[PDB]
């Protein structure tokens, strides 16, 4: 029944500010403590802040103290996180988390129970850039034991994420979109590949639909075979 | 703070196995310890609270035990949807998480199919050349992808990516991308990636010449 939905995430330049919000439903918001927790790439999960049910007490992780501020409006069922002087190390998925609610008040110390879906904050000097989509053309070099592979190279986009869909037949052995790699340029890049029967290399035509919503770009690139 | 260490960091098991994950605290935390399940792109889910009290929504195959500094999470009968990352969290002094334990599906050896793609003409017009080597549907995760340019070993210019384990056939896929400048790409002829895997009868080479 408890529902938490975060909003506010996006791209922010290092040293600027950003405010996250969290809308709560399915429980009595004014009777529950609330946490902010983040999932940092490379690191793990990390507690950020706690706020009492009425906002009378607030505690912060030492790494964000003096820079972040947590607040709430129980009349609007909303939890806020004001983030200032942001650095690239604050790039994470930020989760709104309800403190454990024990109707019986059994135990002495309190953790967390229900997590929100999370909102992604990317602190980087890189600009929001749509991808350049290049075809991974099928050929004899892209055949292995009765299987042929073709794909699309989605290069130099920012920020995450992208989605790639294809026009797959009934015998499509698989669709594999790879996790993006962060290049030294600060831009992301990934490949999306499709495996089909080797006999279908020149029989059918394949097109990858690349969607990068943060840049509001859609690219439909055709992947045609090469004679080699 | 209190430091939480989980063991093992990764474990491979079959559908139906009993799995035990251990979590150790740097200090005594009595029973102020929780276990969370997490899947890629999904919110964490509270499994066990107060070290051993199962949450009402969680199936009874999940069990927790322990006090003080040693804590264990058990899955009596591993179901298909139980393969995820599990985190312990202490809530005695602030809130700190373990490093997480990934539960992988164990299956038979699967040889990778190996593919290579020459750079497209549209990218060469942009001034760069990316060569992609593809390894599809292999198990175990261990594999070796070696780039060779005119039979010279490459290093420091290839980027590798590995998919999550496929929910269907429990295999992995790997892409290796070698990127060069157009001027550097045109100064070499033979481009090849050699793949070594336990499932292969011998190392597999996929090569193309610039311009074929």
């Amino acid at each position: 029944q408890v529902q938490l939905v975060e909003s506010g995430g996006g791209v922010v330049q290092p040293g600027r500010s950003l405010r996250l919000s969290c809308a709560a439903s399915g429980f009595t918001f004014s009777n529950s403590g609330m946490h902010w927790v983040r999932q940092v790439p490379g690191k793990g999960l990390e507690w950020v802040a706690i706020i009492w049910y009425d906002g009378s007490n607030k505690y912060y992780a030492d790494s964000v103290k003096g820079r972040f501020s947590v607040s709430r409006d129980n009349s609007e069922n909303t939890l806020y996180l004001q983030m200032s002087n942001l650095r690239a190390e604050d790039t994470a998925v930020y989760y709104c988390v309800r403190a454990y609610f024990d109707s019986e008040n059994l135990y002495d110390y309190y953790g967390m129970d229900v997590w929100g879906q999370g909102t992604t904050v990317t602190v980087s000097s890189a600009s929001t850039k749509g991808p350049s989509v290049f075809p991974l053309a099928p050929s004899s070099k892209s055949t292995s034991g009765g299987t042929a592979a073709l794909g699309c190279l989605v290069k130099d986009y920012f920020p995450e994420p992208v989605t790639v869909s294809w026009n797959s037949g009934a015998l499509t052995s698989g669709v594999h979109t790879f996790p993006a790699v962060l290049q030294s340029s600060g831009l992301y890049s990934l490949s999306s590949v499709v495996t089909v029967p080797s006999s279908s290399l020149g029989t059918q035509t394949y097109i990858c639909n690349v969607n990068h919503k943060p840049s509001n770009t859609k690219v439909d690139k055709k992947v045609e075979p090469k004679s080699c | 703070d209190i430091q939480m260490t989980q063991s093992p960091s990764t474990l491979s098991a079959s559908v139906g196995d009993r799995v035990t994950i251990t979590c150790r605290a740097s200090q005594s935390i009595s029973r102020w310890l929780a276990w969370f399940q997490k899947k890629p792109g999904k919110a964490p889910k509270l499994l066990i609270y107060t070290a051993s009290n199962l949450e009402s929504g969680v199936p009874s195959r999940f069990s927790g035990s322990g006090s003080g500094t040693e804590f264990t999470l058990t899955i009596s009968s591993l179901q298909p949807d139980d393969f995820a990352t599990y985190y312990c969290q202490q809530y005695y002094n602030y809130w700190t998480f373990g490093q997480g334990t990934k539960v992988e599906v164990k299956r038979t050896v699967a040889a990778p199919s190996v593919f290579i793609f020459p750079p497209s003409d549209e990218q060469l017009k942009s001034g760069t050349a990316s060569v992609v080597c593809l390894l599809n549907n292999f198990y175990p995760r261990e594999a070796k992808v070696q780039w060779k340019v005119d039979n010279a070993l490459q290093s420091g210019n290839s980027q590798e990516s590995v998919t999550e384990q496929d929910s269907k056939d429990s295999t992995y896929s790997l892409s290796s991308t070698l990127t060069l400048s157009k001027a550097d790409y045109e100064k070499h002829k033979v481009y090849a990636c050699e793949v070594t895997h336990q499932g292969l009868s011998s190392p597999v080479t996929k090569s193309f010449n610039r311009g074929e």
Partner: peptide, 10 residues
């Protein structure tokens, strides 16, 4: 007067 951070926040 401030409670411990891990005290009951509800």
């Amino acid at each position: 007067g401030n409670p411990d951070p891990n005290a009951n926040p509800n």
